[PDB]
């Protein structure tokens, strides 16, 4: 059976106030997760402070 390591990258498109992410597993194999991250584009109309 395949049991190993690595990294996985996928695509997430949409506004940040409406999307959601989930994980599921009902297979007879172990699972372990370490970290995560994301990338985005930002736009502002007024300086803070």
């Amino acid at each position: 059976t395949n049991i190993g390591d690595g990294q996985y990258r996928f695509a997430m498109n949409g506004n940040a106030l409406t999307t959601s992410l989930t994980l599921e597993s009902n297979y007879p194999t172990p699972v372990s997760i370490v970290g995560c991250g994301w990338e985005a584009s930002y736009a502002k109309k007024a300086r803070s402070v």
Binding site: T1, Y27, P28, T29
Partner: protein
């Protein structure tokens, strides 16, 4: 090959081609004289598998002269692939062998069956014309 003929009146018979399952092999009893005749036998009550290369007839009549044995592979995936399982060489081999076997099966019976269906349609037209 894929098509075989044997004379009637023999307890023991032999098959001459490979197969993937016992259900694929089909055996029927043959009389040349009557086309509307020629029933097909079934497992259990008519014949039993002695050896995977041998076959024996449980019940036989005296109204036929030839027996017919030919292969007929199904069109369903024998092997099933699922996540969280193991891969074995046997699956990879048999799955490929299936389509190959189908090829020589079709190559043989298609042209043979063409005659019966074509002349059946022609005869039907023939009696329909005059009567």
């Amino acid at each position: 090959s894929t098509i075989t003929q044997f004379p009637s009146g023999n307890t023991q018979y032999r098959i001459e081609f490979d197969y993937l399952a016992r259900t694929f092999v089909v055996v029927t009893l043959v009389n040349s004289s009557n086309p509307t005749l020629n029933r097909v036998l079934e497992v259990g009550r008519d014949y039993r598998f002695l050896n995977p290369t041998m076959i024996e007839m449980l019940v036989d009549q005296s109204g036929f002269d030839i027996v017919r044995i030919h292969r007929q592979t199904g069109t369903d995936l024998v092997v099933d692939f699922r996540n969280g399982s193991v891969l074995t060489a046997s699956d990879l081999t048999n799955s490929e062998l299936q389509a190959i076997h189908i090829a020589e099966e079709g190559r043989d019976q298609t042209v043979d069956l063409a005659k019966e269906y074509a002349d059946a349609a022609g005869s039907s037209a023939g009696n329909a014309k005059d009567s």
